[PDB]
Amino acid sequence: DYNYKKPLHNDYQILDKSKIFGSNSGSFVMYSMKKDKYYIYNEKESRKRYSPNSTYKIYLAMFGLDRHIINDENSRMSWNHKHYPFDAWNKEQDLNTAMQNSVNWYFERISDQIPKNYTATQLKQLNYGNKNLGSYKSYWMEDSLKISNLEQVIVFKNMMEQNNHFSKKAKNQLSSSLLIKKNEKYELYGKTGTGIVNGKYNNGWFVGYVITNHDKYYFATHLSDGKPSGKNAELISEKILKEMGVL
Amino acid sequence: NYKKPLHNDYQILDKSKIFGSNSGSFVMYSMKKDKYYIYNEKESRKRYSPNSTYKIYLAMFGLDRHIINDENSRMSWNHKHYPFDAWNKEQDLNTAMQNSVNWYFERISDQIPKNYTATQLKQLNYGNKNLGSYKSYWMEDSLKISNLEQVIVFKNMMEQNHFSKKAKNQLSSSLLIKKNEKYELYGKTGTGIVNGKYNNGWFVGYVITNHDKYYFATHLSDGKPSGKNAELISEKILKEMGVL
Ligand SMILES: *C(=O)[C@@H](NC(=O)/C(=N\OC(C)(C)C(=O)O)c1csc(N)n1)[C@@H]1N=C(C(=O)O)C(=C)CS1
Ligand SMILES: *C(=O)[C@@H](NC(=O)/C(=N\OC(C)(C)C(=O)O)c1csc(N)n1)[C@@H]1N=C(C(=O)O)C(=C)CS1
Numbered sequence: 001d002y003n004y005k006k007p008l009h010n011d012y013q014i015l016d017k018s019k020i021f022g023s024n025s026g027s028f029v030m031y032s033m034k035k036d037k038y039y040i041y042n043e044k045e046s047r048k049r050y051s052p053n054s055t056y057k058i059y060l061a062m063f064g065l066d067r068h069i070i071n072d073e074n075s076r077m078s079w080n081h082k083h084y085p086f087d088a089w090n091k092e093q094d095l096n097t098a099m100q101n102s103v104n105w106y107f108e109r110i111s112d113q114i115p116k117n118y119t120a121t122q123l124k125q126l127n128y129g130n131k132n133l134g135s136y137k138s139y140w141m142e143d144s145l146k147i148s149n150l151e152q153v154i155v156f157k158n159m160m161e162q163n164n165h166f167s168k169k170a171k172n173q174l175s176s177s178l179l180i181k182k183n184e185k186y187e188l189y190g191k192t193g194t195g196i197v198n199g200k201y202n203n204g205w206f207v208g209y210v211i212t213n214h215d216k217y218y219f220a221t222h223l224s225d226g227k228p229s230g231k232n233a234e235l236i237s238e239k240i241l242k243e244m245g246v247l
Numbered sequence: 248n249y250k251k252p253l254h255n256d257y258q259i260l261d262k263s264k265i266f267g268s269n270s271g272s273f274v275m276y277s278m279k280k281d282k283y284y285i286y287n288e289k290e291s292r293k294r295y296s297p298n299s300t301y302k303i304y305l306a307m308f309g310l311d312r313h314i315i316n317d318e319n320s321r322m323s324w325n326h327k328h329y330p331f332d333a334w335n336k337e338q339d340l341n342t343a344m345q346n347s348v349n350w351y352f353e354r355i356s357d358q359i360p361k362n363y364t365a366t367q368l369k370q371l372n373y374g375n376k377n378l379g380s381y382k383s384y385w386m387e388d389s390l391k392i393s394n395l396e397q398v399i400v401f402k403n404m405m406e407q408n409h410f411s412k413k414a415k416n417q418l419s420s421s422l423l424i425k426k427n428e429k430y431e432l433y434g435k436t437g438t439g440i441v442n443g444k445y446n447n448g449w450f451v452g453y454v455i456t457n458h459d460k461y462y463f464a465t466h467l468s469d470g471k472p473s474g475k476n477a478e479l480i481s482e483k484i485l486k487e488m489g490v491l
Contacts, residue, residue, distance in 0.1 A: 073319065073413055169318060183424040 002130070004047040004148040004161070015041040026204070028240055029153045030219040033161070040150065049129055049146035054126065054193040055207045055247050056140035057107045061095060061177060062159065063122060064110040065170035071096055072173055077106050099177040102230075104193065125164075126148045126155050141201065142195045144174030149222040152207045159216040160209070162212065178208065180219065186247055190237070192230025204228035206237045210246055215247055233236055249292045249374070249393040254330055258284040262420065265483045268468030271448070272343035274398045276462040278406070282310035284488070285395070294391035295466065300437040300451045302352045306421065308367065309355040310414035314369060315340055317413060322351055344421040347436065347474075353383065370409075371400050379464065383411075383466055387439045387447065397451045402462040421454065430491055431455045434481070436474025447474035450481045452489050461490055 017028055017039075027046040030039045040046050064070045070077075081100055084090050088101040098106035116136045123131040144147060150162065151175035160171060178189040190208025194201060204223035221237040223229070240247025241247045258451055260274055263286075272287035285291055302306040309315040320340035329335055334344035335481035340411075343351035361381045368376045375395055379389030391401070422433040434452020439444060453460060467473070485491050 072416075176420065179426060181428075182423060 003049050004129070005153050006127075008150075011035060011116050012235050013037065013039045014043065017240055017243075018209050020236055020243065022226070023038045024228065024232060024236065026221060026223040026225075026228070026233070027149045027192070028072070028219070028221050028237070028238075029150050030217050030241075030244070031244075033216040034155075034214070035219075038150075038153075041240075043150075045224075046150040046222075047148050048224075049148045050196060050203050051142045051145060052129070052140055052147050052152070052193060052205070053142060053195045053203060054102050054104070054146070055191050055220075056193075057102070058156065058178070058191050058207065058216060059122075059126075059128070059159075060107040060110050060114075060140075061099065062166060063114055063119070063168060065116065065173055066166055067114060069110050069113050070211065072122055072169060075173070077109055093116040094179045095173065099191070108245075111138075117168060126159060127151070128155055141155045141181040142197060146214075148196050149220050152205070152220040152222075156207060156220075158211070160218075180208070185212065188238075188241075188247070190234070192234050194228075194230040201228045204230050204231035204233040206230060208237070210241060217241075248294055249396050253283060253395075255281060256314070257281055257285060257287075260284055260286040262484050262487070263481055265487065267470075269467055269472065269476060269480065270466040271465065271469070271472065271477075271480075272394045273463070273465050273481070274395050275488070275490075276308045276398050276402050277459055277461050278402075279459040283395075283398070286484070290466070290468065291395045292393050293468075294393045294396075295447050296387045296390060296398070296438045296439060296448060297374070297385055297392050297404035298387060298437040299311075299347045299349075299451070300397065300435050300449045300464075301390070302344060302347065303418065303422070303435050304350045304356050304367075304371075304373075305359075305385075306344065306418050307353075307400070307404070307410060307414060308359055310417055311410055312324060312359065312363070313442055314355050314358050317417060320417075322354060324408055325350075340417065340421045344435065356383075356385075368428065372389060372396070373400055375465040375468070377481070385446060394449075396462050397466075401451060405462075424452070429456060430490040432482075432485075434478070435480055438472075438474040445472045448474050449475040450474060452481070454485060460484075 027042040029046050077093050079091050090104045093103050119133060129147030130246035133139050133145040139145045175189060178191060180190055181188040186209050190206055195203035200210050207220045209218045212239040223233050260461040272291040284329040289405035322338050334348045340347050361378060365378060367375050374392030377389040378384050384390045387401050398491050418432060422435055422436055425460050434450055439447035451464040453462045465477045467477045
């Protein structure tokens with residue numbers, strides 16, 4: 001019920017990206033590693049907490065790797081033969097296929113193997129939003145757990161960049177699963193999220209990072225109105241990153 | 248020259264226009280269709296030094312013999328000045344493969360006995376299998392392989408083996424060049440220079456699409472036969488063929 005209030009002790013730039021957002025409402029946040037600087041479109045809104053829905057698969061994947069539920073030799077999980085609505089979900093998966101095709105059951109299976117105590121300790125160490133696990137059952141799916149767009153960037157950057165307990169091998173395997181585009185100029189990584197309530201999209205995300213020859217940027221777009229889908233959050237992120245000369 | 252018959256379906260191509268001022272050959276193999284596609288059949292069978300495309304094999308060997316590993320593929324720079332800025336630093340398998348850092352792979356080769364190599368080359372059916380004086384044998388020296396063979400050998404090495412799935416995946420990650428919505432392109436260039444002129448250019452790799460996996464290789468013998476131009480020609484041909 002409370003939003004993100006911790007102040008930023010960094011160089012900061014206010015952005016005007018309303019033309020790219022068009023009819024869609026939300027916020028955009030980017031962090032430059034080299035400059036130690038935040039760039040934010042709609043800063044008050046960037047601090048409003050929302051369910052992370054599928055961006056939380058980034059963390060379920062890191063936790064699954066840290067607890068050795070999945071590893072670099074075997075991240076394969078069997079399909080249980082239940083009919084899912086998306087054909088890409090109706091088959092055996094590994095980490096890369098599950099992440100790419102946002103296969104909910106794969107991450108739910110990892111979550112069922114993780115003790116609440118471990119998850120609470122990690123969310124505390126990561127300062128993950130409201131750290132609210134609720135009933136601890138699909139808590140990241142439009143439920144108790146909430147995080148702001150600004151925190152999505154701070155939290156991800158810190159998980160990946162801090163000198164912490166997650167192994168280099170786990171970070172590498174997670175990164176590989178998140179790669180979307182690679183060309184001569186950059187590598188773009190990221191994860192979409194889409195929520196639906198009462199037949200209407202209501203919570204869209206695209207969380208990621210870009211590695212260029214000059215810098216590394218962490219970023220996130222959140223959409224709450226208009227056509228708030230993860231696919232639209234991704235398109236908006238790509239347009240903003242190209243407009244700022246990152247891509 | 249490579250003389251063994253192809254025992255698979257194949258299509259002979261004319262990609263003469265793309266090659267243009269340059270000369271050489273192109274070979275592709277489709278996993279799903281179990282078919283080869285070949286431009287300039289005669290040249291595709293001529294054997295040439297693999298130069299830097301052999302880094303693919305030294306990296307595999309390095310991973311097999313645990314000279315380089317999953318947790319650590321890092322190698323410190325000895326501080327010697329090299330003509331390329333990208334070589335003048337510490338390396339890992341990925342930076343070494345991307346920037347074709349000769350010293351990294353030479354250091355792996357020096358730790359491999361002739362015995363192990365001779366058996367891998369025999370197992371892999373690697374060109375003329377000629378290891379010669381066993382020094383920098385892959386560098387415009389004794390070891391030679393045809394463009395047709397670069398595809399058959401690589402496909403077999405990755406798809407048929409005593410090599411680990413984890414080693415194959417690590418080698419694969421080091422070879423990734425391009426990735427988009429439609430495909431992932433992996434590959435390694437090779438450039439040879441003799442008497443001051445580019446004389447032997449290569450681009451060997453594979454493409455993964457949502458529908459198939461294709462192994463391919465372009466060899467250049469005239470015009471401006473650099474690995475850079477072999478890569479350019481490969482991308483134009485793959486685009487024309489619908490692989491992209
Ligand atoms: C992650 O965000 C996942 N989203 C969902 O499961 C939810 N809605 O998605 C679909 C499947 C389209 C639906 O209409 O049910 C959802 C979770 S909580 C809530 N109220 N709705 C998956 N991720 C994506 C993505 O953007 O990557 C999807 C497009 C859907 S599945
Ligand atoms: C692998 O092919 C490597 N090639 C070389 O080291 C050789 N020549 O490179 C140049 C830069 C042209 C030189 O003037 O030394 C070479 C090996 S044996 C021989 N007679 N020449 C490296 N790979 C590439 C590549 O295409 O990836 C290079 C452009 C050069 S270094």
